[PDB]
């Protein structure tokens, strides 16, 4: 049960500075080096640097020294990384990875997240349109177009539906998301009984329930 | 520019041995690089398997081993498991900083091959009434997890206003993904044919609709 808990995600405006966290539990915090990695889909991974919890001894990747500041609070066993003067380029997932020294060298445990989004875009409610066929028996759908910023919650028939439902990840065109969720049903329920997706966008305090109709 | 490189993707079956390799651009990968191998499973779950060229991180199954082959670092997985399907990352130490590879997306054929289940949705009139059109093409139940989606308007390949998601693992372990085609209501009213082409394991599937 060695654990590295990290906030799932944080939203911040370009030009600001965030302070990400990595709570450690399970092992003696000060006898393991801690590292910070940055990942952006398409790019792969980049090493930011490492801090030595016992000394506070720090070591950076030159490309990140005037942008990141690593530190730790021994009593609470958590590690921090403060990113400054945020830009688009700094939108990414930032991992904290525990490091093993001597006997040998190990990068054993990893925290799991914290995707950071740096955008100067205002909240935007989604638009929900019913996806019906033109023409496991019939597939239906809900298009959740143009909302900002993540996440969104899609449910089908308030939970009454468990199978066939496939919510997809969001795409980002024009600094604006969009996704869709699908649910397949026996040609019997449709149009006999009817399906209704339950889109919810927390940031915009919006909830739209749409029933899918014939076409 | 000291870049590190790896195999984009490799495929193996349950029980077989497979080797992943790591190139150093400076030259031979040596012990002084302390090769580190990291595993990334679905939904960003990372775990380091081998550190320091061949030290197995405690708690890691014995079927994982590291070494040097030629002038490259290697990750040997013997007796390939189904859970072992994941992408593997390589990390080298160059004096004062680490450098990763692009990662090798490893496929362990732990289930039968299944072609994509494609569905093409036309533009809803509600969206149409806002002067914008969107075709949605859901692609489910395919394995392995790689497909190539192509859109075609009037039989002609279109490559603008197109967004395809990266395949995502389903409940039953198969892969699903979605693609989109957005146009102005106007643009949509002049063409007659619209089709979502999905290519999987050399077999191509299409779903068309005529406005």
């Amino acid at each position: 049960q060695v654990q590295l808990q990290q906030p799932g995600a944080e939203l911040v405006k370009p030009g600001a500075s965030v302070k990400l966290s990595c709570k450690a539990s399970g092992y003696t915090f000060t006898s393991y080096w801690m590292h910070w990695v940055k990942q952006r889909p398409g790019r792969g991974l980049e090493w930011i640097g490492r801090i030595d919890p016992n000394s506070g001894g720090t070591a950076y990747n030159e490309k990140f020294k005037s942008k990141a500041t690593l530190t730790v609070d021994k009593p609470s066993s958590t590690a921090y990384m403060q990113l400054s003067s945020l830009t688009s380029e700094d939108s990414a997932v930032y991992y904290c990875a525990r490091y093993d020294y001597y006997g040998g060298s190990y990068f054993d445990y990893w925290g799991g997240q914290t995707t950071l989004t740096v955008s100067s875009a205002k909240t935007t409610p989604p638009s929900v349109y019913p996806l019906a066929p033109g023409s496991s028996m019939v597939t239906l759908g809900c298009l959740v177009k143009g909302y900002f910023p993540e996440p969104v919650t899609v449910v089908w028939n308030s939970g009454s539906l468990s199978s066939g439902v496939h919510t997809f990840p969001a795409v980002l065109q024009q600094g604006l998301y969009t996704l869709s969720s699908s649910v397949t049903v026996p040609s019997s329920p449709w149009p006999s009984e009817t399906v209704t997706c339950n889109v919810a966008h927390p940031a915009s305090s919006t909830a739209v329930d749409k029933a899918i109709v014939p076409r | 520019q000291a870049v590190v490189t790896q195999e984009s993707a490799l495929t193996t079956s349950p029980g077989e041995t497979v080797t992943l390799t790591c190139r150093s651009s400076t030259g031979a990968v040596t012990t002084s690089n302390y090769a580190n191998w990291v595993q990334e499973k679905p939904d960003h779950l990372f775990t380091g398997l081998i550190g320091g060229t061949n030290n197995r991180a405690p708690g890691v199954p014995a079927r994982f081993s590291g070494s040097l082959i030629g002038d490259k670092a290697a990750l040997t997985i013997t007796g390939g498991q189904t859970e072992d399907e994941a992408i593997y990352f390589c990390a080298l130490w160059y004096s004062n900083h680490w450098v990763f590879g692009g990662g090798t997306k490893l496929t362990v054929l732990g289930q039968p091959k299944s072609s994509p289940s494609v569905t093409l949705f036309p533009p809803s009139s509600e969206e149409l009434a806002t002067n914008t059109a969107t075709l949605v093409c859901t692609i489910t139940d395919f394995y392995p997890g790689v497909v190539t989606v192509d859109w075609t308007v009037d039989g002609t390949p279109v490559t603008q206003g197109m967004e395809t998601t990266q395949p995502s693992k389903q409940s039953n372990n198969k892969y699903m993904a979605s693609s989109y085609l957005t146009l102005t209501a106007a643009a949509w009213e002049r063409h007659s044919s619209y089709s979502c082409q999905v290519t999987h394991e050399g077999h191509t599937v299409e779903k068309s609709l005529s406005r």
Partner: peptide, 10 residues
């Protein structure tokens, strides 16, 4: 250049 001691802040 690192991998310890002489370096806290770099």
């Amino acid at each position: 250049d690192l991998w310890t001691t002489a370096i806290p802040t770099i």
